Amino acid sequence: IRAGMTDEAQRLCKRCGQAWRAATLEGWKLYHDANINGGTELQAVEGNPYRCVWKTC
Amino acid sequence: SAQCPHFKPNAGVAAIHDYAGWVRNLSNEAGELEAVVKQWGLTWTLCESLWGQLKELEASLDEPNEYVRNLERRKAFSHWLAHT
Numbered sequence: 001i002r003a004g005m006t007d008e009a010q011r012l013c014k015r016c017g018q019a020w021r022a023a024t025l026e027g028w029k030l031y032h033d034a035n036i037n038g039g040t041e042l043q044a045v046e047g048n049p050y051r052c053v054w055k056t057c
Numbered sequence: 058s059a060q061c062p063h064f065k066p067n068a069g070v071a072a073i074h075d076y077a078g079w080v081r082n083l084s085n086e087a088g089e090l091e092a093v094v095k096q097w098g099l100t101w102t103l104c105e106s107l108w109g110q111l112k113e114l115e116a117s118l119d120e121p122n123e124y125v126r127n128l129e130r131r132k133a134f135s136h137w138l139a140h141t
Contacts, residue, residue, distance in 0.1 A: 038122055 001025075027054035073111055076101045099141065106130070106137040 001009050013022035027048050034043035048054055080098055087094055116129050
């Protein structure tokens with residue numbers, strides 16, 4: 001994480017059998033719904049809409 | 058038009074808000090009236106969640122996209138289920 005390698009930290013958590021901890025490292029992802037503005041193709045919702053709760057935890 | 062007059066509901070516009078508004082007045086004294094008010098309340102609020110098909114604080118302020126329309130019905134029916 002100190003090296004900016006948060007994706008390698010998540011891969012390491014999954015490999016060590018701690019996939020739950022890998023999921024806790026994703027709660028800092030900015031909420032984005034590309035469908036709010038009316039696109040021609042449905043895009044997948046990004047980030048954590050409950051960021052404030054996750055950050056407080 | 059005939060010597061036997063004919064009623065027909067005003068074509069179907071607001072009855073869900075008349076019924077939901079009516080039970081939102083019976084709730085003022087429903088604390089002690091028990092017959093089948095909860096049974097009818099479950100049914101008519103289900104009908105509002107499903108074929109509501111009414112105002113949603115402008116559910117659309119501008120234009121409707123069927124994905125949004127269906128997600129917004131899943132929000133309204135999820136709020137009904139939580140309240141039940």
